[PDB]
Amino acid sequence: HHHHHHMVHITLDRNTANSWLIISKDRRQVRMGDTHQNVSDNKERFSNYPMVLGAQRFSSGKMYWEVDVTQKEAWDLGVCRDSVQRKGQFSLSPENGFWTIWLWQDSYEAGTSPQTTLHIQVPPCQIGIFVDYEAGVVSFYNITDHGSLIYTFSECVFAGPLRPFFNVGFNYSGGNAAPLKLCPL
Numbered sequence: 001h002h003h004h005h006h007m008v009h010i011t012l013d014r015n016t017a018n019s020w021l022i023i024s025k026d027r028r029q030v031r032m033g034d035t036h037q038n039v040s041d042n043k044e045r046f047s048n049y050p051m052v053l054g055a056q057r058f059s060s061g062k063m064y065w066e067v068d069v070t071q072k073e074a075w076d077l078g079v080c081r082d083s084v085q086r087k088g089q090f091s092l093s094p095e096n097g098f099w100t101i102w103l104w105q106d107s108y109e110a111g112t113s114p115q116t117t118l119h120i121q122v123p124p125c126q127i128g129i130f131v132d133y134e135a136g137v138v139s140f141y142n143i144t145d146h147g148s149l150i151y152t153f154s155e156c157v158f159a160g161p162l163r164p165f166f167n168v169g170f171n172y173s174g175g176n177a178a179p180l181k182l183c184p185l
């Protein structure tokens, strides 16, 4: 792909984070803490899952960023509507305002309803995310495998401003403590 030139500098929005997340001082890395991180509750925080949004809002144009997923067992990545539900249980689906892929139990899947099996030969250490607002497109690229396509959501109905979306996953196993990191441009 030739999307690299639409690179945007993404930072994480503390105020949206689940109360167990630890966001680095530079707002470029996030990991699951082993306890509540001593923050007040607010209506923005994701309550049920280890999720956080980027601070940036996109309503037009072409945007590209990269995320490091090294050594993680489980995570979700993509974009979502600014108006997504924060409290209680929900599925990741375009009907609920999410355009995502994930790793879970040694398989990669796209967040369609129902979910779609992904075909990845080289487990990725870094993921590239491309959004074309006007075209209604969200695409995912395997940076570890020369930028090979993972998945394209097309005919997307964004229906509002979009925010970068992250889930570091639970760490019940003791094997998923590693952070998500926004990679330098």
Ligand SMILES: CN(C)C(=O)N1CCOC[C@@]12CCOC2
Pocket (backbone or CB within 6 Å): 018, 019, 020, 047, 048, 049, 050, 170
């Ligand atoms: C750490 N853990 C397994 C949790 O139970 N947490 C803590 C972080 O917020 C989400 C919830 C899941 C169920 O609601 C609370």
